[PDB]
């Protein structure tokens, strides 16, 4: 999920 913010 981090990839969608980072």
């Amino acid at each position, epitope marked *: 999920d981090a*990839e969608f913010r*980072h």
Partner: antibody
Amino acid sequence: VQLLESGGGLVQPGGSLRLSCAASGFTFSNYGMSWVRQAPGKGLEWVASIRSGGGRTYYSDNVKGRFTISRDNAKNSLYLQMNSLRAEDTALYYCVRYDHYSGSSDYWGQGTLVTVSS
Amino acid sequence: YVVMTQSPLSLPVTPGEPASISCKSSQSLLDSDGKTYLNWLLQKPGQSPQRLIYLVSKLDSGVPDRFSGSGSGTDFTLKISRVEAEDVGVYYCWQGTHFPRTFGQGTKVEIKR
């Protein structure tokens, strides 16, 4: 919100397969999406992600260079092109929506089963 | 890279009684933006996963408030105040702070009827 996967089946080791996921009930082009897989009787493993913007993508170490995630916003569809399949790729593949409003993946599809075998 | 460890892996519980599942990460899930991206889902028998909780303690749509989540940093807990038959299945925590996404091993809740 509905996510409906298809395309799973039996493939020879080293072969290729294309999975599709048809989305409805939301504005598809506004959401990031991912594929997550579950080997029979086992846990959950993230496979690949694609942003709502720019076709930016991300892959797990195990599938780098073999799988390609894409989307067709016109057709409300997410795809996974799987090449050079290995026995260890055998699993139920789920289409999963990322909810930017809650900061977390939310809806999962029903999954499509990929079996890699001779 | 961030390892999520759940305990216990099997959880038999008598209906009406509370249950608790631990989820510990190998490093802090506090993001630089101030938020803590720790989530819980449930996979009921024969069904696809469904989210129960996000941002540690926030209940998703339609989830009853007998479920609660707490914790900070590396140590998290899902509690069910009173377990019901419909709560049977496999519970997973996962983190959204660090790339790549990682899930716990899953805790299977059994109802002791």
